[PDB]
Symmetry: D2
Subunit: 116 residues, 4 copies
């Protein structure tokens, strides 16, 4: 599994469950093409977005739909979403975990990049 | 000053100086329109981006060119840029400070909305 | 002002106001000696903790009473307090800003060391 | 496993390996008694610190030895260590993960608390 997302909720001290995530890849014409999407599980994790074969070199945007997550919990958050934009596989195949920590007016995102 | 940006460097423990920042507003057709830009000062701050007259309710994107910042320090970063997308509202508090803390493989962003 | 503290609230997007802060210096016997204290202002800041004459090289602990802050907002927090421990050095930059971002089950702290 | 530590390195985008961790518990006389210690593994994780039986109600301090970690990588960091202080098991047994993200002049710590 070459592309990982893991989301935590800094208000509840829990995984952030059912968080929608949309992945895009920059096309040759410089537009964002839809690449993959999904929702975090009970554990706050999202696996199986892509395969090594399909996950080629490129610039990727991981959109984490934070506003919808917070709204459902009765909180009016600041951000529309978190977007994490990065070049992937530009030195051969890697495994990426995008880790996000969510508060209503703040978020952090960290990448864990490993060589399999 | 309705909209300020402050950027800090978590590796050097300093303001992040000369970081390019580009602000966009979402247009009716859902495309991003350039709105304002600048570079952070020696205090890591960017002021005078817009005015209260111009800064109307709407969706905005603040783009922070973190990749160029790290490259100028000889450090290989993960992100192309940091991206902060939000709705500006007239209701609640109306001075917006977008704060950002930068590491090569991590960033955090916080909004300070005051009266 | 050799040592400043700024505290932000990540739930409300505001300065963290009236947060008690206690500063300690490590004594020769490795015990913590009270050094300075105060409460954050309406801007979430604490100034005038010490002077350049008094703020000598040594190990310091800045304790931020986050638990009481959350309790006053009716929110159940994880931590007893935030704890920031560091060596003050004369060599490098010498205005220290201890910045802290608070969530109920999370906090971040950053040091801004300037010239 | 009722007490978890997981540490990441925000400079290298990797787990923080061989990070020393010391756990203390507040005694009846208000002193910090040594409770458990260990080092993060290749995955940045530390397991097996304690057992449900030994992990009773109390106030705990998790000290993460960040300064030694950074020094070995040739970086002079700001903090001596991270200390995470919390009441545990004060409403019955829980499982705790203390998650830390490290930069030379900054750190964050989040708790993930689950009911088994
Ligand atoms: C070690 C670690 C993990 C691994 C895990 O949970 O399995 C993690 C996962 C997430 F989804 C979010 C954060 C973390 C984390 C540390 C951490 C990161 C950012 C912050 S922000 C900058 O306040 C604080 C702490
Ligand atoms: C109080 C505060 C300020 C205000 C200031 O210093 O002027 C600030 C400005 C920034 F550009 C970035 C962070 C902070 C901050 C606390 C803080 C925020 C995020 C993190 S991340 C999530 O580790 C950690 C600490």
């Amino acid at each position: 599994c070459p592309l990982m997302v893991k989301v935590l909720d800094a208000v509840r001290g829990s995984p952030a469950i059912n968080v929608a995530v949309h992945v895009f890849r920059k096309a040759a014409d410089d537009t964002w093409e839809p690449f993959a999407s999904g929702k975090t599980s009970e554990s706050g994790e999202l696996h199986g977005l892509t395969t090594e074969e399909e996950f080629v070199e490129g610039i990727y945007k991981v959109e984490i739909d934070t506003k919808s997550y917070w709204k459902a919990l009765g909180i009016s958050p600041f951000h529309e979403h978190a977007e994490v934009v990065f070049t992937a596989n530009d030195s051969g195949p890697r495994r990426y975990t995008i880790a996000a920590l969510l508060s209503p007016y703040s978020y952090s995102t960290t990448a864990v990049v490993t060589n399999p």
